Curated annotation (Swiss-Prot), chains A, B:
Residues of the active site: 41, 140
Protein name stated in the entry: 3C-like proteinase nsp5
Reported function: Cleaves the C-terminus of replicase polyprotein at 11 sites. Recognizes substrates containing the core sequence [ILMVF]-Q-|-[SGACN]. Cleaves and inactivates human TRMT1, preventing tRNA guanine(26)-dimethylation of tRNAs. May cleave human NLRP1 in lung epithelial cells, thereby activating the NLRP1 inflammasome pathway. May cleave human GSDMD, triggering alternative GSDME-mediated epithelial cell death upon activation of the NLRP1 inflammasome, which may enhance the release interleukins 1B, 6, 16 and 18. Also able to bind an ADP-ribose-1''-phosphate (ADRP).
Catalysed conversion reaction: TSAVLQ-|-SGFRK-NH2 and SGVTFQ-|-GKFKK the two peptides corresponding to the two self-cleavage sites of the SARS 3C-like proteinase are the two most reactive peptide substrates. The enzyme exhibits a strong preference for substrates containing Gln at P1 position and Leu at P2 position
Activity regulation summary: Inhibited by pyridone-containing alpha-ketoamides compounds 13a and 13b. In turn, alpha-ketoamide 13b (tert-butyl (1-((S)-1-(((S)-4-(benzylamino)-3,4-dioxo-1-((S)-2-oxopyrrolidin-3-yl)butan-2-yl)amino)-3-cyclopropyl-1-oxopropan-2-yl)-2-oxo-1,2-dihydropyridin-3-yl)carbamate) inhibits SARS-CoV-2 replication in human lung cells. Inhibited ex vivo by michael acceptor inhibitor N3. Inhibited ex vivo by compound 11a and 11b.
Lineage: Viruses, Riboviria, Orthornavirae, Pisuviricota, Pisoniviricetes
Domain of life, per lineage: Viruses
Covalent link location (Glycyl lysine isopeptide (Lys-Gly) (interchain with G-Cter in ubiquitin)): 5, 85
Residues of the full protein shown: 3264 to 3569 of 7096
Subcellular location: Host cytoplasm; Host Golgi apparatus; Host nucleus
Residue intervals on the Cytoplasmic side: 1-301
C-alpha cells in the first residue's frame, strides 16, 4: 500500500553517462555501444550548427568516461543531437531502444553534471510538450527513460529551460518535443492543459488505497463530462482513454463514467480542505500503466 | 531551475539486491561483501525468533542473485535483522556505512520484489518514526539509503505496514525506528507532526526558484514563532535549526526569523488557492541539505 511518485531504477543508465567537453562548454553525453550522444549546442560558444560542425575536428571533443578519457574517431549531427563515434564500445551498454513518447505519458530523469549522476525523478510529457524538471547549468545531455523488463526505452534528452522554469528537450533521434529550438532566442511554452485520463488513473489509485471521500452515486456521459473538462482546461476524454481505464475500473468496480462524475464534482466544488494520496491538488503525472505498475509491483530484471 | 522530489542514484544499491526465500516467505536481501541482510520474519510461517532461528539450517535459506544461487555458510541475528553469511563476496559491493537517521532526515527507497528493483523514491523519517512508502506484499528487505560523495549510507530496511497505511522498519543494525515490533499485533503510529525546519527549507527552495506570493515584511522571535508552531502540529524550532538554515538564509538574504513570520502567516491564513512549488500543501520532506544540494547540483562519483 501507499502511492508515491516512483522513478525507474537508474543503474542501467548511470553506466552510460559520460562528460562531453568542447571549448568553454561541458555537458553530459550518453554512450551506447561505440557512439556517444549529446546535445549539439555543446559545439556553440542563433548559430549555424552545420557551419559550426564542419569547423570542428575529432580532436576538439573531450569525452570523459569517469577516470578514462575517450578518443573520438568520428562525428555527425542528427537534428539537434551530436553522434560522436569513439574507439571503445561501452561494456555497460544495456538492452535499449530509442522511442518517441506521446504527451500525457511519463518517464524518469537521471540528472547529471560533469558526467556524474546527481539524482533521479519522474516526469510527464505535458500536453504543451514541456516537462517540469530540476535542471541546473550543466545538466544538459541528461536523459529520460522508461524500463521494459530489461529494455531502456530512452525517450528524452535535455537541452534547455524556458523562462517560466519548465524544460524542453528532444528524443534520442534529435527531434524536439514541441515547437522548441536550441537557441537563446525567446520562446513561450504554450498553454498547459491537464491530462484528464491520468487524473482518472490517479483517482483509481486513490480508491485502491482507501481515499474514497470524493466518490458519489451519480453517473455521467462522456459528452456531458467532456463539456465540463473543457471549462477547467482539462484535456478531452476519448473512448480510447475510457478503454485504457478499463482494468482499473474492473479492479475497483467503479465504472469509468462513474469515476468521471466524481472528477466533475471535485472540479466544480474543489476539495474542501481534504487531501487525496497526500496531495491537495489533482495529480496528473500518473498514467494508467503507472498506477498499475505501482499498485501491483511490476519489476524490471 | 525547478524543484522535484529527487532521489539518489540507485545504481550502487541495485547491485546489492537478492531474493531470500525460506518456506513460503519471499523477500529481498541486501548483500554487502559476504553478508546478506534481510528481515528476520522471513523465517516466519507473536513468534520467538530465537526459537524460530536456532531451528533453521543454512540450506533453508534460498538466496538467489539473478541466475546465481548463493550458498549460505552461516547465519546470525542482530535485533530484527538476519545476517546470512555466504561463500561469495559481492563483486559489486560499494563503499558503505550503516547509519541511524534522526527524525526529519530524508532518504531514498529502492523498492524491490523478488530481488528485482521496481522503482526508487524519496522519503522522510516522520517524527512518529514512521515513513510514508509504496510497499506491496513482497517488498520487505527493500532498503533506504543516502549517498555521501562515493559512499552509500544505508539507513533503513522495510519490515511492515501499520494499519493507517504507513510503513515501519529498522536501521541496518536491526533496531526499529519508533516503538514498533515485527509482530502481527496492533500498533498505532502515534501522532505525526510537521518537520518545521524542513518546511522552512522548502520555503527557501521556493524563493530560490522564484515562487513569490507568500513572503511578508514581518518578523518574530523564535519563541513567538514556536508558540504558533505548537498550535499547528509543528515541531518546535531550535537555534540549532536556525543555525542550520543559515546558508539558505545567506543565499536568499531572508533572515530565518523572517521566514518564520512567513510560515506563521501561511499557517493562520492558509494558501488561498495559491500553490508553492506545484503543491497546495506546506511540504516538509526536504532537508536544508536536500535543498542546497539540488539547488547547487552536487553530484556523486
Ligand atoms: C545545458 O545544460 C543548459 C540547461 C539549462 C541551463 C540551466 N537549466 C537548464 O535547463 N542549457 C542551456 O543553458 C540552454 C542553452 C541552449 C543553447 C538552448 N539555455 C537555457 O536553458 C537558458 N535559457 C534559454 O536559453 C532560453 C531563453 C528562452 C526564451 C524563449 C524560449 C526558449 C528559451 N530558452 C537558461 C539557463 C536561462
Ligand atoms: C513484507 O514484504 C511485508 C510488507 C507489507 C505487506 C503489505 N505492505 C507492506 O509493507 N511485511 C508484512 O507482511 C508484515 C509482517 C511482519 C511480521 C510484521 N506485516 C504487515 O506489514 C501487515 N500488517 C500487519 O501485520 C500489522 C498491522 C499492525 C498494527 C499494529 C502493530 C503491528 C501490526 N502489524 C500488512 C500485510 C497489513
Amino acid at each position: 500500500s501507499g502511492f508515491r511518485k516512483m522513478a525507474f531504477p537508474s543503474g542501467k543508465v548511470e553506466g552510460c553517462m559520460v562528460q562531453v567537453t568542447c571549448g568553454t562548454t561541458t555537458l553530459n553525453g550518453l554512450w551506447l555501444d561505440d557512439v556517444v550522444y549529446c546535445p549539439r549546442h555543446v559545439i556553440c560558444t542563433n548559430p549555424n550548427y552545420e557551419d559550426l560542425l564542419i569547423r570542428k575536428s575529432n580532436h576538439n571533443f573531450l569525452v570523459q568516461a569517469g577516470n578514462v578519457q575517450l578518443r573520438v574517431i568520428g562525428h555527425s549531427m542528427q537534428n539537434c543531437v551530436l553522434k560522436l563515434k569513439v574507439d571503445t564500445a561501452n561494456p555497460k551498454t544495456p538492452k535499449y531502444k530509442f522511442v518517441r513518447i506521446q504527451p500525457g505519458q511519463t518517464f524518469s530523469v537521471l540528472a547529471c553534471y560533469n558526467g556524474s549522476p546527481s539524482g533521479v525523478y519522474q516526469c510527464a510529457m505535458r500536453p504543451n510538450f514541456t516537462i517540469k524538471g530540476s535542471f541546473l547549468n550543466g545538466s544538459c545531455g541528461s536523459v529520460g527513460f522508461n524500463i521494459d523488463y530489461d529494455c531502456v526505452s530512452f525517450c528524452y534528452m535535455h537541452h534547455m529551460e524556458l523562462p517560466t522554469g519548465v524544460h524542453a528537450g528532444t528524443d534520442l533521434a534529435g527531434n524536439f518535443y514541441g515547437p522548441f529550438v536550441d537557441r537563446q532566442t525567446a520562446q513561450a511554452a504554450g498553454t498547459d492543459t491537464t491530462i484528464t485520463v491520468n487524473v482518472l488513473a490517479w483517482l483509481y489509485a486513490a480508491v485502491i488505497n482507501g481515499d474514497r471521500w470524493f466518490l458519489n452515486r451519480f453517473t455521467t456521459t462522456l459528452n456531458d463530462f467532456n463539456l465540463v473538462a473543457m471549462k477547467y482546461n482539462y484535456e478531452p476524454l476519448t473512448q480510447d482513454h475510457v478503454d485504457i481505464l478499463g482494468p482499473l475500473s474492473a479492479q475497483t468496480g467503479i465504472a469509468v463514467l462513474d469515476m468521471c462524475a466524481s472528477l466533475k464534482e471535485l472540479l466544480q466544488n474543489g476539495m474542501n480542505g481534504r487531501t487525496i494520496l497526500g496531495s491537495a491538488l489533482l495529480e496528473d503525472e500518473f498514467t494508467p500503466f503507472d498506477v498499475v505498475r505501482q499498485c501491483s509491483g511490476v519489476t524490471f530484471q
